[PDB]
Amino acid sequence: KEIMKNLYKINLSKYINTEDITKSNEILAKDYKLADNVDVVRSKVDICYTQCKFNECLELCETVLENDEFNTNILPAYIGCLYELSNKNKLFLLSHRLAETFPKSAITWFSVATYYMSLDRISEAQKYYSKSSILDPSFAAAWLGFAHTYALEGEQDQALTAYSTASRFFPGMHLPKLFLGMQFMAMNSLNLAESYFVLAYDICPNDPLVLNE
Amino acid sequence: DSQDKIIHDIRIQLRKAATELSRWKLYGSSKWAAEALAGLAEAIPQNGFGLSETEYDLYLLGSTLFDAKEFDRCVFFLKDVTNPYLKFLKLYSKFLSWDKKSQESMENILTTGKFTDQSNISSILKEINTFLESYEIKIDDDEADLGLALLYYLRGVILKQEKNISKAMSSFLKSLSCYSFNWSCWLELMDCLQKVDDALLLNNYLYQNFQFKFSENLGSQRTIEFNIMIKFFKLKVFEELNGQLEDYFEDLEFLLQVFPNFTFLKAYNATISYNNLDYVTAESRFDDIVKQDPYRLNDLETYSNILYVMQKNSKLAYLAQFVSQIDRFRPETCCIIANYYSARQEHEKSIMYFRRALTLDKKTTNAWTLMGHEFVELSNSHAAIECYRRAVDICPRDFKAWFGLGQAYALLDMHLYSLYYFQKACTLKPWDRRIWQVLGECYSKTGNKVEAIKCYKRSIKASQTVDQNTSIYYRLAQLYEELEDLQECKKFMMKCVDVEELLEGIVTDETVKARLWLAIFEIKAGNYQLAYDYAMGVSSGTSQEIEEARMLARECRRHM
Amino acid sequence: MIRRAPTTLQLSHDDVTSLIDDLNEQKLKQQLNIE
Amino acid sequence: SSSSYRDSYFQYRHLPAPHHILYAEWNQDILALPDEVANITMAMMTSEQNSNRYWNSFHDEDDWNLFNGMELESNGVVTFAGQETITGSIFDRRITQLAYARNNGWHELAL
């Protein structure tokens, strides 16, 4: 009972009482032989990424990828971590390695697109985000990055439509609603931004981004 | 049992070995000594010096002023000291002051040496001899300390730079006998060796009439059979000179057992596979180095050399960015990048880094030949000729330089003018298939068919695998046809076709012309049945090849 | 999923120009008292 | 005064050879990035095209054929080009299979 409670608790969402998850994975680590398994370190990486502890993010991601070089469970977080750290060279290695091995999966093309994104290639990276989105639906990373490519440089008119598609097709996440409200602020429309932000706060109560906005 | 006792012995010695060598501010062996201890197989500080508190104060001034690059100021304060431990430090400070100073003096000077192949240097040498006579041991005694052994190392190295070989060798052996486990001492000893036959003479001396000072060295170590440096000498000189191997197999596996995690051993082990033209296994051996030790700009020059042939441009592009991030002042990091820039067909930029890689350390003469190649791909033959020629003038025993210089003339129409260069390269490495085949082409292109026959025949014997003889057999048969003895060329025609069957139907281009020619002659011989099967077996060649055999098949079929 | 830079705003031109004008007022009126 | 007594930064004795300062320009050299800048050599807008081609080489035949003229619009409507048109909303799984079908499948009016 207790070990399965902890194992399921590993996978629960963050932003709420993370200290409980820390205690639970700490208990699971030393008491049982599951001390450095894939999901416990995946949860540690997710915790660090949410808390922007990117040094420990990279350290844990490396010590796990050294074992499994193509673990798709951690690759989105790993790629985001590398983008934030702007490790161009490591990102290029990962992009080539996944291009030679997994051309069909959208993770590879997301990696190539973010490699382009780290080089200020938004106009070109739009196409590769589109490719990643098409090859795999229900992927928040690809479509959110596509909307980011839209909103980053000019062409503000249809960034609203892109974010509306993100919100409608991906219900239950505060991030697309917050982004759409942010963009409504950017066009200097105020009431709609406030309405979307109160919606986002309703969706997620504990998030610095939404309260700051 | 006894192996575990040896392991416990090595740790005590290597802890001792790295102590004073670092304490005496020479890093040629101190860096290597700690490396050996780190990779040693898993199974209070030790220090001692006979120094008085009055003179020991001078040591702190001498030691700290050493690594602060103020070698000259260390000499002035340490002038009047009489202890041998400090006397070595003063002259070591003087020598490194000169060795450093010579480096700043010449930086535009790429080639190093004297065309025909002191006084300030002789001042250091006289001080060594004057102090050695005054001191009351003068080696050859059981009570011989480390410093006097270490002092002889300076005498050996200062003698070699004057080109007084065969006296520095004796000095190194005296220093090595009183104190082994000095890696920098071995390297200078290895450098003065020139030919394999000298190594056999030197190897014997280390066995019959060579013994270590059992007083200084710890027990169960002074034995030559159970030493480690004598072993490390075997793997180094026997393979860098590519000499005949003896007492080399049983030692290598013995070192892998004691040193499973030694980074230097695996890279040398990887280099052995590289030197035998076995690249695929070499890649696996090297891949362990990068994962285990990511920051090692010592043997990666071969790694980036392997990747260029592998055409793994992505993997090489990773290395160029990763290696350059550490530092751009090592000789290797400026050679790693040049390979990556050469693979992208950007020669005017790659040519720059090779000159850069050589300027940082002029001892890396391997970069001259590579610098020459990037000119030939640039369609600039005049510049290449000088670039190759410098390499052989640094050291005449360079097979790479002679061959690279021979080709540059062969690319031009001056075929005969290149015969001398290829002939010189033959004597360096006679046991190579590659050099012999090129000589045959030069003789063939200069109308010397009588000589070219014997040239190719020698090449065939040198080839390790029968497969590689497919190209030589077809060309060798053509020359006989040029000599107008059709019966003689038949035997070589049989062999080149038969290699296709032995290789489970390789169906290569130069056997396609073989079968077509063989079938044509068989028609003239009247044996249509024996010619019919030749046409069918070659029915998977080029567009003109298949139709030539198809029509021949119909003709012999009708008469069948 | 990646978050962009959160919205932050700095000193506009209108408020800094208003402070410039007020600052001129206070460095203009006091010398009348001095004179 | 006191100049060499402080050791709080990279100084002239931390690098191995003090005379390396003579060059002291190799640090400020941007190394050519791996793939796209290979096209600027051939040319001596085009470099980005070669980057697209280089990263586009990692396709299967049918997958590339699907993505030959693929254009994705902001609202999610995707148009697929046949070498007919396959305009439909993305994020439904059936449309991509239907594009695959009309791409590699056999269709014959037969009079």
Tab-separated table of C-alpha atoms in Angstrom, chain B residues 68-69 100 104 107 317 320 324 328 337 340-341 344-346 352-353 356 359-360, chain D residues 12-13 15-20 22-23 26-27 29 31-34 37-38 41:
chain	number	residue	atom	x	y	z
B	68	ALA	CA	55.632	32.386	-10.278
B	69	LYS	CA	57.693	32.363	-13.531
B	100	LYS	CA	61.624	29.407	-21.595
B	104	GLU	CA	60.091	33.699	-26.767
B	107	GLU	CA	58.135	32.209	-32.631
B	317	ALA	CA	31.448	19.110	-35.250
B	320	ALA	CA	35.433	20.978	-32.492
B	324	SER	CA	37.690	24.719	-28.498
B	328	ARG	CA	42.634	27.324	-27.773
B	337	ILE	CA	39.461	22.055	-35.177
B	340	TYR	CA	36.721	19.579	-38.674
B	341	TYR	CA	37.314	22.572	-40.947
B	344	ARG	CA	33.723	20.835	-44.742
B	345	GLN	CA	35.903	21.491	-47.828
B	346	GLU	CA	37.025	24.855	-46.408
B	352	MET	CA	45.505	28.454	-41.113
B	353	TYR	CA	44.871	26.314	-38.028
B	356	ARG	CA	48.619	27.658	-35.773
B	359	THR	CA	53.451	27.317	-33.830
B	360	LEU	CA	52.294	26.573	-30.273
D	12	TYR	CA	50.373	35.948	-16.397
D	13	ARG	CA	51.499	32.845	-14.481
D	15	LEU	CA	48.697	30.159	-18.358
D	16	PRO	CA	51.610	27.764	-19.011
D	17	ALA	CA	53.745	29.835	-21.394
D	18	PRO	CA	53.907	33.586	-20.641
D	19	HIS	CA	54.593	34.352	-24.319
D	20	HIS	CA	51.162	33.159	-25.487
D	22	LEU	CA	51.795	37.595	-28.223
D	23	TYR	CA	48.922	36.063	-30.203
D	26	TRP	CA	42.419	33.220	-30.993
D	27	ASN	CA	39.997	33.609	-28.089
D	29	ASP	CA	37.210	33.737	-33.067
D	31	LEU	CA	33.777	28.946	-34.749
D	32	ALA	CA	31.589	28.133	-37.734
D	33	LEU	CA	28.418	26.448	-36.536
D	34	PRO	CA	28.055	22.860	-37.688
D	37	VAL	CA	27.327	27.711	-42.706
D	38	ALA	CA	28.677	24.994	-45.008
D	41	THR	CA	31.507	28.259	-48.843
